[PDB]
Amino acid sequence: HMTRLDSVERAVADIAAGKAVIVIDDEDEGDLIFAAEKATPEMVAFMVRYTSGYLCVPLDGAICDRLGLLPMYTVTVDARNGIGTGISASDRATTMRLLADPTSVADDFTRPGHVVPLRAKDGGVLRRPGHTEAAVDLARMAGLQPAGAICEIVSDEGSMAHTDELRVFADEHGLALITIADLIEWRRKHE
């Protein structure tokens, strides 16, 4: 059988509406992805529920330069101000939104923390076909700050089987399911 994939257009519209999507790369693996600026306690709580471990914030290179995250997971951050210990859904949502804020600088944050910033390659999935790049691409395509929030979904037995389970899971929560391959193809034709 061939499992249904959503259109990239639907994934982008979900991202814009502040919803999450699931992105597969036919290379490893599905990640849950939303735009970092759209982080809420409820969406972080949802991500935390299904994360294999880390919650990451893919960032455009220009953001990383501004934050001092040079090309040179050991960097973790929390928002310095307006949070508890940094681990709550609400705290992590604040941290994520701050990372997407076009005026944030290193000292708006503390180290160590509960969110992992990641540097996306310039050019996005056209340059490097990774989940990190896809997240930034989707946020930017949605008209948002070029900053995403990602996690690997807890898996673990078979290839065809992974995709079918992801499709059901997506549908139970109203999420779009796409591949990086389709994102590449869309971008290439719509850029």
Give the separation between CA 13 and CA 120, rounded to whole angstroms. 21
80 labeled part of a ligand binding site: no
Name which of 31 and 91 has its Cβ closer to Zn ion.
Answer: 31
163 labeled part of a ligand binding site: no
Among 38, 114, 131, 167, binds Zn ion (CB under 5 A): 131
- Residues touching Zn ion: how many (CB under 5 A)? 2
Burial of 172 (0-12, 13-18, 19+ CB in 10 A): exposed
Give the separation between CA 55 and CA 42, rounded to whole angstroms. 14
Question: 50 an active-site residue?
Answer: no
Instruction: Specify the stretch interacting with Zn ion by CB under 5 A; choose among 73-81, 83-91, 110-118, 127-135.
Output: 127-135
Reduced to 3 states (helix: H, G, I; strand: E, B; else coil), residue 93 is helix
Burial of 42 (0-12, 13-18, 19+ CB in 10 A): exposed
List 43's β-bridge partners, or say none: none
Question: 173 an active-site residue?
Answer: no
129 labeled part of a ligand binding site: yes
130 labeled part of a ligand binding site: yes
Question: 137 an active-site residue?
Answer: no
Residue 173 as a binder of Zn ion (CB under 5 A): the answer is: yes
Q: Which residues are annotated as a binding site for D-ribulose 5-phosphate?
A: 31, 128-132, 152
Active-site residues: which are they? 27, 31, 56, 73, 78, 114, 131, 152
